RNA sequence: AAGCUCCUUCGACGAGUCGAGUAGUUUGGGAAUGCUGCUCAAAAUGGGAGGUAAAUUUCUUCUAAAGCUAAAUACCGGCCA
RNA sequence: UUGACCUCGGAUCAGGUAGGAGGACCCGCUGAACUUAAGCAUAUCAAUAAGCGGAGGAAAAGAAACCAACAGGGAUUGCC
């Protein structure tokens, strides 16, 4: 039993996409999550993962809609930031 | 409109992907891989080898298809692939060898099912007139028309055709994007490898005048027949040796 | 191969197994009137009368299993329509 | 020549006439016992081509067998289980052949032809008195009926190498070490 | 006569969904505002909440 | 190659001279029932099928109906006078027909046929 | 008239039809079987 | 038998127009390479060189196609939030990954 | 009663069985090697298995779904030698 | 009212037959594990052992919906 991080295993394209892959041994450019909206969406998945199984179907849906609304508000802020960057 | 196409210029193409009776499991796997490539493709079951070859045209009219990809198998070992426009167009017969399907765990590449590929052709495809006919039949069969409702909206794989020997080598590759060092493309092989040996090109649909003949094709059955003739020739040389040696002893 | 002079053989009565008997074709046509039509043959009959000849051959393959069987079955049922409008 | 008309009628089992008759007879057989005797064959064309005669010594028996499976698959057909149950019921008779008559969603129906080997009409008549010989006791138990020959793979060709001349016999011949006197 | 390559009324692919999502499970989109992408490359938004 | 139980399936042929005596007494027995007749039926001369054995020739099962007629032997009389008849085989060439007609003629020349009862 | 799906087998036909697995043409065509016209 | 006039007439009866002045690249998505790739392969039996020539030939087609498609506004990059059916299943991709772990573990445990 | 011959006359050949789909088992044998269950369910110049790149499925060879039949083969038991 | 035919019954009716044993060899059904792969799970053991049914002096198979590609062979079985 050894870690996949230590072995030089290539990333494989699955239903979950690989995306753009950064080269090994070079600068993996840091993206910051200082924004409160970007802080809320990460917080929604942490609280959802720890809570686990809920018997209620409605409360199970509200646990997912909180994550969905957090993603939408963050995306609107990022698009407004992208528009402000395009103006500048 | 019932073409399942949303485009300003509609390139209406339907391909009928069809297998013969005596195909192998490897031949069936290659059909399964190529049919997953084609959103405008319909799979078809075992075709009677005792039927007539132009009954494929009556078959493709029924399924409303203007292209036929026919997998014809001989002796339970060999594969022949046919490409044809259905009513009147040209028809080419290949001999398919060196098959490696998607299930082989040495490829490491994957792509979207039904996405529109980039067709990589070779310079020899535009020089030789018979390779120009094959290229257009390859562009019709593996086209994946632009506004097709069963297609996928992003591009992640390239289908390549290469003329190296007197044969056509077919490869798939995955467009993998890598961030540039202060984006670039890497290719990872996905799917089917198969070598096509052009045997004949017909003017009719599955029969008609012959426009091109290979005249260099060594069939698999000619290799088998040469081995059996060599086995019998070895035995006959033994009998002629014994007949000569007995005649020498009687002298 | 070797040069051996060929000779023509008598026609084999087993090679006449391909049936051309006028009496058997009489019996098959008379029984078809008496027996009637299968449930799936009624679907083919209705589709051929409505003009959906393509749908008829697809349905009859899915019931029989072969293009040769689907082609013949639509051809016998086509001649039943032809002879029924002649009697009527 | 009524039997040629009957042969063509049995080809069209899904037609209006045959499906109506097979419906009302399936209900009638379920009202009766699982194994019972038929006075006459319900398919006289089929019985006659399988070797039935209207002589004293020939009887016809009807039988149901529950269809389905044991995911394990039985190596003999349901016709074979139908033949063995009739032969146990009529221990003095010999099973000659059997044929399909009806089919339900729960039962398969068969009719079995039996020959009495002690009836004088059978014994004096050649071309049937081979069944009087003691080598033909319980042919359905040993797989000598028509469905038995199909299940044991007794067909000529390169597609039945392991099953011609017996599967266990051919396996045994291929797995003995033959040692001669001068090796 | 040339074949018109159109889908007939009885065809298996006569009606194609707009989602362009295959036989994958739909639990991949559980935490997302959108559900799939159409053929043009723009995501399909979830309708509303009952 | 002894992964199975070969010890319970092993055949030793110590009856090799015993079965030779049994086979020779079986040949003597059918020479006593058929005393002036041969103990074997006459068999045609055929060519071996494959290309390895085209040049060589061997005895076949029975004479064809056509070569039996050309030699003057009726069908229903040939099994009664010791000639094997094969209804499956075909002549397919004049060379196979001529060799068997000559063979049947040579058998006729050497035959003594007894006048019924 | 109210159609109530109680049996699990009618649910199976409902799951096939509502998904893009069996069409309206396939359900009508396969209803012409031996249990039909009785 | 090589009927050069017949093959061209067979082409023109089934040929749809591929011109940069007439039709966009999104219509056809086919690129013809400049080199013949036979010059890149001296020996057919050389598996490593022959596969590198085929990998190379489709590499310019991907680069030429990507430049042309981005010029016309057609989306190219798959987004990270696009989950869809692929040609090889996730079960097959799992065996590919487990095979890669096995050779990676075997090479390093050899050095251990 | 029977064999042959000739012919301006005729010449009937086995269906819930082949076949297609699927599951299990089996084989050196996914042209599924065979077998069995379930669903659908045939044909009449027909059907089955092969040969063939040779230009279209051309050619070759047999008739399945009824039945009988001695010998050459086996034999730790039976009556003996 | 009487008489046919069909189906179904009764009788210590007249005459018959089956069961059990044996099972070395034979025809089917059902069906393991130890072992090997220095562990083990595909595989192998093995389409074996154990279990169930059915015959004879032999049983079974058997007169091509066969082999073949030949200048052709010609039911089955067994040996090399």
From Swiss-Prot, chain E:
The organism's place on the tree of life at top rank: Eukaryota
Location relative to the cell: Nucleus, Nucleolus; Nucleus, Nucleoplasm
Cystine residue pairs: none
Subunit note: Component of the NOP7 complex, composed of ERB1, NOP7 and YTM1. The complex is held together by ERB1, which interacts with NOP7 via its N-terminal domain and with YTM1 via a high-affinity interaction between the seven-bladed beta-propeller domains of the 2 proteins. The NOP7 complex associates with the 66S pre-ribosome.
Protein family according to the UniProt entry: Belongs to the WD repeat BOP1/ERB1 family.
Function recorded in the entry: Component of the NOP7 complex, which is required for maturation of the 25S and 5.8S ribosomal RNAs and formation of the 60S ribosome.
UniProt name for this protein: Ribosome biogenesis protein ERB1
Classification lineage: Eukaryota, Fungi, Dikarya, Ascomycota, Pezizomycotina
Gene name of the encoded protein: ERB1
């Amino acid at each position: 039993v050894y870690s996949e991080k230590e072995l030089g295993i290539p990333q494989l394209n699955t239903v979950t996409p690989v995306g753009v892959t950064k080269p090994k041994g070079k600068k993996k450019g840091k993206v910051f999550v200082d924004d409160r909206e970007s802080m809320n969406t990460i917080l929604a998945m942490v609280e959802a993962e720890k809570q686990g199984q809920i018997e209620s179907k409605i409360m199970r849906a509200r646990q997912l809609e909180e994550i969905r609304e957090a993603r939408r508000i963050e995306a609107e802020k990022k698009e407004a930031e992208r528009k402000a960057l395009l103006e500048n | 409109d019932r073409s399942n196409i949303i485009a300003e210029r509609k390139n209406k193409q339907r391909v009928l992907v069809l297998s013969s009776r005596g195909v192998t499991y490897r031949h069936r796997h290659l059909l399964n891989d190529l049919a997953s490539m084609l959103p405008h493709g319909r799979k078809d079951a075992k075709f009677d080898t005792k039927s007539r070859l132009y009954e494929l045209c009556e078959l493709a009219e029924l399924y409303n298809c203007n292209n036929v990809l026919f997998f014809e198998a001989r002796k339970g070992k060999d594969l022949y692939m046919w490409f044809s426009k259905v009513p009147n167009g040209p028809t080419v017969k290949f001999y398919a060898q060196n098959l490696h399907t998607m299930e082989e765990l040495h490829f490491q590449g994957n792509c979207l099912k039904g996405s529109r590929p980039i067709l990589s052709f070779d310079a020899a495809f535009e020089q030789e007139p018979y390779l120009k006919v094959i290229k257009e039949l390859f562009l019709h069969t593996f086209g994946v028309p632009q506004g097709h409702k069963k297609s996928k909206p992003f591009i992640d794989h390239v289908l390549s055709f290469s003329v190296a020997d007197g044969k056509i080598w077919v490869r798939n590759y995955e467009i993998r994007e890598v961030e540039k060092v202060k984006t670039d493309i890497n290719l990872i092989e996905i799917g089917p490898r198969f070598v096509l040996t052009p045997i004949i090109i017909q003017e009719g649909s599955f029969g008609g005048p012959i426009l091109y003949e290979n005249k260099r094709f060594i069939s698999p059955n000619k290799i088998r027949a040469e081995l059996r003739k060599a086995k019998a020739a070895r035995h006959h040389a033994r009998m002629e040796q014994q007949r000569d040696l007995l005649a020498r002893k009687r002298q | 191969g070797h040069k051996t002079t060929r000779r023509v053989l008598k026609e084999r009565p087993s090679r006449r197994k391909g049936a051309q008997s006028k009496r058997t074709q009489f019996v098959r046509s008379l029984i078809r009137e008496v027996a009637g039509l299968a449930p799936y043959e009624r679907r083919v009959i209705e589709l051929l009368r409505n003009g959906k000849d393509k749908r008829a051959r697809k349905f009859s393959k899915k019931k029989l299993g072969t293009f040769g069987r689907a082609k013949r079955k639509c051809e016998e049922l086509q001649r039943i329509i032809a002879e029924s409008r002649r009697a009527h | 020549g009524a039997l040629k008309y009957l042969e063509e009628l049995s080809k069209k089992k899904q037609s209006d006439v045959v499906r109506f008759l097979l419906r009302v007879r399936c209900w009638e057989y379920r009202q009766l016992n699982v194994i019972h005797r038929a006075s006459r064959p319900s398919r006289p064309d089929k019985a006659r081509r399988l070797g039935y005669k209207a002589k004293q010594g020939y009887v016809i028996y009807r039988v149901r067998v529950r269809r389905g499976g044991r995911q394990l698959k039985y190596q003999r057909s349901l016709r074979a289980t139908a033949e063995e149950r009739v032969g146990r019921r009529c221990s003095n008779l010999r099973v000659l052949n059997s044929y399909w008559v009806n089919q339900d969603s729960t039962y398969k129906y068969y009719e079995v032809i039996l020959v009495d080997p002690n009836h004088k009409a059978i014994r004096r008549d050649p071309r049937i008195n081979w069944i009087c010989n003691p080598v033909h006791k319980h042919r359905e138990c040993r797989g000598l009926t028509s469905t038995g020959k199909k299940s044991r793979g007794l067909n000529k060709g390169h597609r039945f190498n392991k099953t011609r001349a017996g599967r266990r016999k051919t396996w045994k011949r291929h797995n003995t070490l033959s040692l001669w006197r001068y090796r | 006569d040339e074949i018109d390559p159109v889908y007939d009324s009885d065809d298996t692919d006569y009606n194609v969904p707009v989602n362009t999502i295959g036989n994958i499970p739909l639990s991949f989109y559980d935490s997302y505002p959108h559900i799939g992408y159409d053929i043009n490359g723009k995501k399909i938004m979830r309708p509303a909440t009952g | 190659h002894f992964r199975k139980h070969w010890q319970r399936r092993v055949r030793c042929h110590f009856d090799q001279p015993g079965k030779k005596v049994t086979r020779r007494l079986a040949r003597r027995a059918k020479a006593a029932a058929l005393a002036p007749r041969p103990v074997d039926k006459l068999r045609p001369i055929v060519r071996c099928p494959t290309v390895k054995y085209n040049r060589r020739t061997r005895l076949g099962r029975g004479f064809t109906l056509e070569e039996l007629k050309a030699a003057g032997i009726p069908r229903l009389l040939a099994p009664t006078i010791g000639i094997a008849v094969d209804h499956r085989r075909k002549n397919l060439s004049e060379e196979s027909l001529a060799a068997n007609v000559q063979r049947l003629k040579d058998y006729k020349a050497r035959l003594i046929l007894f006048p019924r009862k | 008239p109210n159609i109530d799906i109680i049996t699990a087998e009618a649910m199976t036909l409902a799951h096939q039809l509502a998904t893009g697995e069996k069409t309206k043409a396939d359900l009508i065509d396969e209803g012409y079987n031996k249990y039909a016209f009785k | 038998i090589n009927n050069k006039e017949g093959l061209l007439t067979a082409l023109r009866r089934i040929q749809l127009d591929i011109n940069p002045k007439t039709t966009p690249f999104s219509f056809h998505q086919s690129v013809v390479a400049s080199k013949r790739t036979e010059d890149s392969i001296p020996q057919i039996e050389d598996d490593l060189q022959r596969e590198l020539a085929f990998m190379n030939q489709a590499l310019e087609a991907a680069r030429l196609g990507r430049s042309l498609l981005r010029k016309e506004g057609v989306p190219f990059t798959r987004p990270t939030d696009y989950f869809a059916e692929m040609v090889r299943t996730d079960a097959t991709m799992e065996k590919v990954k487990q095979k890669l772990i096995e050779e990676a573990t075997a090479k390093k445990a050899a050095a251990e």
